[PDB]
Design a protein around this ligand. Sequence first.
Ligand SMILES: [Cl-]
Ligand SMILES: [Cl-]
Ligand SMILES: [Cl-]
Ligand code: NA
Ligand SMILES: [Xe]
Ligand SMILES: [Xe]
Length: 129
Amino acid sequence: KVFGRCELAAAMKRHGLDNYRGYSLGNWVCAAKFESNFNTQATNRNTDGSTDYGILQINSRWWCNDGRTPGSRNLCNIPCSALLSSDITASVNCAKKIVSDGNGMNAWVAWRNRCKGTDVQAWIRGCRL
Ligand SMILES: [Cl-]
Ligand SMILES: [Cl-]
Ligand SMILES: [Cl-]
Ligand code: NA
Ligand SMILES: [Xe]
Ligand SMILES: [Xe]
């Protein structure tokens, strides 16, 4: 599924992401825009052989099992395919574990490079929330 901007903001809010670990909703919407262009089916392979999955591009070396990333840790205890669902619940629950891991949202390279320090409130402007 490809979400609309406000539709995703509303879904993320309902799943408890607004101000989760101090990150306002706009941060999460901005990260999703630049990681996946709001597409739950997005995948991208990395040079180390791991693959990033779903709306928040969660990586198979640490967080999910895809059966093809040797020595990987599956910290979210889920098959990576679960992260591609139209239902964002699995992605949200795993993202909460990631953002709690010590480096906050710096775990998402697109967030660090394209959202951090910008007016992220613009991402939720106009939405009925
Ligand atoms: Cl915000
Ligand atoms: Cl894909
Ligand atoms: Cl980047
Ligand atoms: Na893994
Ligand atoms: Xe891929
Ligand atoms: Xe998400």
